[PDB]
Design a protein around this ligand. Sequence first.
Ligand SMILES: Cc1cc(S(=O)(=O)N2CCC[C@H]2C(=O)O)c(N)cc1Cl
Length: 557
Amino acid sequence: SMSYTWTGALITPCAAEESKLPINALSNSLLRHHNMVYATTSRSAGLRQKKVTFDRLQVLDDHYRDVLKEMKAKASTVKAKLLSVEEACKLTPPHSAKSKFGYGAKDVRNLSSKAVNHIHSVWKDLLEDTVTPIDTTIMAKNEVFCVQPEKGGRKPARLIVFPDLGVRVCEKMALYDVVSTLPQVVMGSSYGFQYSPGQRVEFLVNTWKSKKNPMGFSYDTRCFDSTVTENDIRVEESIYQCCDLAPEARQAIKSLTERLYIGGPLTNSKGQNCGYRRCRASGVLTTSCGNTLTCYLKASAACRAAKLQDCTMLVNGDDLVVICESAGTQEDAASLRVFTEAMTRYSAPPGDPPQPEYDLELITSCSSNVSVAHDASGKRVYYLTRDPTTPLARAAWETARHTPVNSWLGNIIMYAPTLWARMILMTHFFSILLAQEQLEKALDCQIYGACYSIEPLDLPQIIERLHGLSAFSLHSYSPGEINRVASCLRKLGVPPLRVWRHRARSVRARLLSQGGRAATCGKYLFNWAVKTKLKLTPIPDLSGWFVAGYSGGDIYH
Ligand SMILES: Cc1cc(S(=O)(=O)N2CCC[C@H]2C(=O)O)c(N)cc1Cl
């Protein structure tokens, strides 16, 4: 069936949308090529609609079924709990979109009687009705990128489809525990979201080593959400249903599946019917877990069809990477063809054809790749990095405009060991925080789809716990990484690293003069900017981070 059916009504914005990079007095210090940065708007919704609207056909064989039976077997060992209303409420983001029934995220977090009462009615309705399609709002996402000449210029906005706040709280009650625990049990070490960036690197490295003659490839399916069929979504539900669940949760999960996850009508911000959906909704609690399960199932079955030996996979939603025993350059390239053919049969055709790789560092998954640097003792060490183009473009935007999500902070946290994050991101933003005296001001960022509220003064401890003390001492990066960064800076008109090192000394001195937690930031985050280093000793914090992905899941911590 068709992924979507449209009425003709436009995807409308809910507020004024900016497309050009906002500019203030701080802009030029970071980036000069302003015309290269842009944000997507509803204005390009039509283009996206065309890319994501197509017919899906599925041909399921024994390998698919065999894999599924195995997945259900592990799933049946899972026991999930129903979340109370108060519990679900506290998982709601302070700035989550308000309900159309008279209450917002604040009312939900405070457990207002109005909010709580409506939630109870929605829940009761889920239990009493398993057939009425639930409404959803389709919106065009506003995201910042750098123009990509060798791609088509600018990317059209991505679409987000989500149900009302009341329904969103109900999803949490019925499936938060499920989507938080099931994946790791079913997929084991292949479930990507259970790792911090350092553990991810470690798992890729040990997996690569575990093979006599390693070979790996990333597999990117075209518009994964749109390739997800009704069958896929019902298979996802049969898996959830394998868990030891409370009778009330089974009914709720069956209801949400039939009424929301399988598909439903699309309404714009103006309240007009835009059409109907028959594929994965990007804005529901099961988006990450569902995509991950479906991707793991199709790829695992595809590996058997292609006869790839000793296949170890790493899955993060729709992002797939596979490492296995090479049977030879020629044999490997042939297998990939079969793999891709099977994936296609399963309704997961490729965007960019997959290609075998024999150098772990040349594989990009989740927009990242492993690279090498050296620690204090001079030891060779691996860490996760990525092309800094998008992170820098977003930093530029956030430099002049406050946003709901601070990507620079999320990036410093996730890529703390990187050359670009340490020299540019940290230097630039701490300078800004210093000038405004907002070092102690908590900021919202996003990690694995979940929203976290974090004080930059806490960066030192956060980084140490996540990446180890070594993150404050890496040096001698690879020529490849150095050149990618230096090249990206010229592309965007960003001052060269030598300028950043000079600025860091100042920011460092400034942080030190303020003593306390600020000084710790200066001492640890910027020890790389001094000629003669300090010792750097552990720093004298709850982390329920890195357990599951919640992209588009409306989750807060
Ligand atoms: C290193 C890394 C970082 C992120 S993240 O920084 O948590 N991510 C990318 C930017 C937005 C954010 C998210 O997924 O919420 C993700 N998803 C995957 C990997 Cl392998």
